[PDB]
Amino acid sequence: SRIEDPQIQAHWSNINDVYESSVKVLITSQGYEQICKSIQLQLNIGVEQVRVVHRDGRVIMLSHQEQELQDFLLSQMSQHQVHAVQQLAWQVLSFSNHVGLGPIESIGNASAITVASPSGDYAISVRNGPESGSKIMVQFPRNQCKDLPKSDVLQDSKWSHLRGPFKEVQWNKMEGRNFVYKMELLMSALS
């Protein structure tokens, strides 16, 4: 499910009862340890399906080979990692909602995650999901090349403060070894 995408660590129990047992599994984003914001714990069931709790007791039942919720957890972990690295290096608010606006109809079994972070005089935005535009990244400055100066040239004191144009980032072919290197583009604020 994930090669360049965030990998998954495995840690099973050291004492398993006759029937029941449990397994600890965390996201463990590459090259970082301050992104441990999604460590879900599940316990196996003999007759019924496994119960699982990510953070808030979200137990759900399932079948033999239907666990695609894992991808949703990966998307949420990506969002949480964006939040954490924003807290590392100018820390935007906590408006990383798990849903919103229905951007691309969000196919992929309820996969929906989108966050954003303006550090200085810029503005970053990200969105992910199950193949419904997984790598979504947008970044745009204030003083741009093309714009509408017609109604604004009349007003004096040119405003290099607001941020009008979307100017998507197209997060492809960039030097991201594990997608957790968005901090590099974040680093492009002032030097």
Binding site: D147, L148, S151, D152, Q155, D156, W159, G164, P165, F166
Partner: protein, 167 residues
């Protein structure tokens, strides 16, 4: 409780209020004798210059300039150049069919203004059935707007109607 001082102090309401000095400033000078109260450089300058000289109160332009690049706002011949300064011409540039720009003539910043008046309504709208339906949905949604706000509500509702045109 100790209000005996209150009314007798309030007695000295009329204009001849100078004796208070001889009552307090000596005793004050006993405890507080500060020559340094405001020795720093200080001078009163009421005004230097004040006028917009370019448009209405800034708030409208300041807010509309923050809109998306999908909208393209400009001005017609200035028939209300100074006081009104509001008759906007907008061009929707996105993944949708283009159309005629609206009027968008607003009132003072209190904003009880359904700004668009559709100066070119009749002939520009009798052209094709599709754009006629666009106009119908536009006015139907505008009627639904409770106390519409020319600043954002107008353009947003117009864009929503233009995006609804695809049935």
């Amino acid at each position: 409780q100790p209000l005996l001082d209150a009314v007798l102090a309030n007695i000295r309401s009329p204009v001849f209020n100078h004796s208070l000095y001889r009552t307090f400033v000596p005793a004050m000078m006993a405890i507080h004798g500060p020559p340094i109260v405001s020795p720093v450089v200080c001078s009163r300058k009421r005004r230097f210059e004040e006028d917009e000289r370019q448009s209405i109160p800034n708030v409208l332009q300041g807010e509309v300039a923050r809109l998306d690049p999908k909208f393209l706002v400009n001005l017609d011949p200035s028939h209300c150049s100074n006081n009104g300064t509001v008759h906007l011409i907008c061009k929707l540039d996105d993944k949708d069919l283009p159309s005629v720009p609206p009027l968008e003539l607003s009132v003072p910043a209190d904003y009880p203004a359904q700004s668009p008046m559709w100066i070119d309504r009749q002939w520009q709208y009798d052209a094709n059935p599709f754009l006629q339906s666009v106009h119908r949905c536009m006015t139907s949604r505008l009627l639904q707007l409770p106390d519409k706000h020319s600043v954002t509500a107008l353009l947003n509702t117009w864009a929503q109607s233009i995006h609804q045109a695809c049935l």
